[PDB]
Amino acid sequence: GSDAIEKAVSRGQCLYKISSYTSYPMHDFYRCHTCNTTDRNAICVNCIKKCHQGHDVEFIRHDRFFCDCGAGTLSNPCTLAGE
Ligand SMILES: [Zn+2]
Ligand SMILES: [Zn+2]
Ligand SMILES: [Zn+2]
């Protein structure tokens, strides 16, 4: 496919800013067990490194997802969405 997702990741931004909740772009996604209000959350790599620094996190797989951190559905607010 195109490099558009990889480029967005390289810019350091959250992938929700290009996926919203209506598309499922393909990239690496992670899970945060510390912020588990939603049970099987999927979090983009920039959010896991910044919004979940020091949290209990795991890489899950490279597959289609939209970022639950940027969507605003986790216990904590996304630090890549406007602070
Ligand atoms: Zn994100
Ligand atoms: Zn977390
Ligand atoms: Zn985030």
The two tokens of residue 13 are 């931004």
Which among 28, 37, 26 is positioned nearest to 71, based on CA atoms? 37
- Please give the C-alpha separations between residue 15 and each of 18, 33, 46, in angstroms, as whole numbers: 6, 20, 8
Is 14 within any annotated ligand binding site? Answer: yes
Ligand at minimal distance from the CA of 46 is 1
The two tokens of residue 6 are 């990889």
- Please name the helix (run of DSSP H) or strand (run of DSSP E) that holds residue 17, with its range, or none: helix 16-19
Q: Is residue 80 part of a domain?
A: no
Q: Provide the residue range defining the domain that includes 22.
A: 4-71
Number of domains in the chain: 1
CA distance linking residue 39 with residue 17, whole number of Å: 22
Extended beta strands in 11-77, E state: 26-32, 43-44, 57-64
Which among 73, 20, 30, 22 is positioned nearest to 53, based on CA atoms? 30
Q: Which residues surround ligand 3, an ion (CB under 5 A)?
A: 47, 51, 69, 78, 80
Q: How close is the Cα of 64 to the center of ligand 2, in Å? A: 20
Is 35 within any annotated ligand binding site? Answer: yes
First to last CA, the chain: 32
Task: Write the burial class of residue 50 (CB in 10 Å: 0-12 exposed, 13-18 middle, 19+ buried).
Answer: middle
Which among 34, 54, 57 is positioned nearest to 44, based on CA atoms? 57
